[PDB]
Amino acid sequence: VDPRAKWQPQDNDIQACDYWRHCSIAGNICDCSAGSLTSCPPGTLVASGSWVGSCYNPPDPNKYITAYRDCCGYNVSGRCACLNTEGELPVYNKDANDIIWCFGGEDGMTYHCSISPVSGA
């Protein structure tokens, strides 16, 4: 509600876009196309490449580094569509979300999905 208002993280949905770990996703949520919050749907290929985001957790109030990995080798799921931009930074690399992070797979460069695993604090 109201696209131009400060991100307001939550910790209870996961399928929704205001979900804490999703502070800088561009794409779609995997849980909505048979994956899980940190796992890819079947028949899909998991990348090595990723892009980071320092997301704040509302329950335990500390930020964590989320590594947004794509699952590739499929077409866009078209499911839980989201675009968040907490600290994104331009193409002059890596904090950058327009890039399709799919480096690693079968040869999977095709965007299907975005995973939201916690990689560190």
Partner 1 sequence: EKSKVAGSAAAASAAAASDGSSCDHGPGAISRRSHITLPAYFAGTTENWVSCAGCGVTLGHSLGAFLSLAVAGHSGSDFALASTSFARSAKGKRTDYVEVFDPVTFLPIADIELPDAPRFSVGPRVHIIGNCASSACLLFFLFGSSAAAGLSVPGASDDQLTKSASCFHIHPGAAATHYLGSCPASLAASDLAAAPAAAGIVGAQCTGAQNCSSQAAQANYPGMLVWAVASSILQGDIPAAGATMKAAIDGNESGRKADNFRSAGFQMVAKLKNTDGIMILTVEHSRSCLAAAENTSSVTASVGQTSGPISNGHDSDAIIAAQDGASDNYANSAGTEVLDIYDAASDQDQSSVELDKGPESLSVQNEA
Partner 2 sequence: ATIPSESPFAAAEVADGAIVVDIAKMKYETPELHVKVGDTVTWINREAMPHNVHFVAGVLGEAALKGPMMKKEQAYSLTFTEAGTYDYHCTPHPFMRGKVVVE
**Nearest to partner 2 of 35, 53 (CB atom):** 53
Residues engaged in binding partner 2 (CB under 8 A): 48-52, 65, 67, 93-94, 101, 103-104, 119-121
CA distance 27 to 75: 11
DSSP 8-state secondary structure symbol assigned to residue 95: S
Residues in the chain: 121
Residue 64, classed as helix, strand or coil, is strand
Q: Which of 17, 52, 54, 79: binder of partner 1 (CB under 8 A)?
A: 79
The single-letter code of the amino acid at 10 is Q
Q: What is the total count of residues that contact partner 1 (CB under 8 A)? A: 71
Which residue in the list 13, 70, 101, 107 is annotated as catalytic? 70
> Any catalytic annotation for residue 101?
no
56 binds, among partner 1, partner 2, none (CB under 5 to 8 A by kind): none
The single-letter code of the amino acid at 107 is D
CA distance 15 to 32: 7
CA atoms within 13 A on the CB side of 43: 6
> Any catalytic annotation for residue 11?
no
Q: Which of 1, 8, 61, 91: binder of partner 1 (CB under 8 A)?
A: 91
Q: Is 99 in the site for partner 1 (CB under 8 A)?
A: yes
88 binds, among partner 2, partner 1, none (CB under 5 to 8 A by kind): partner 1
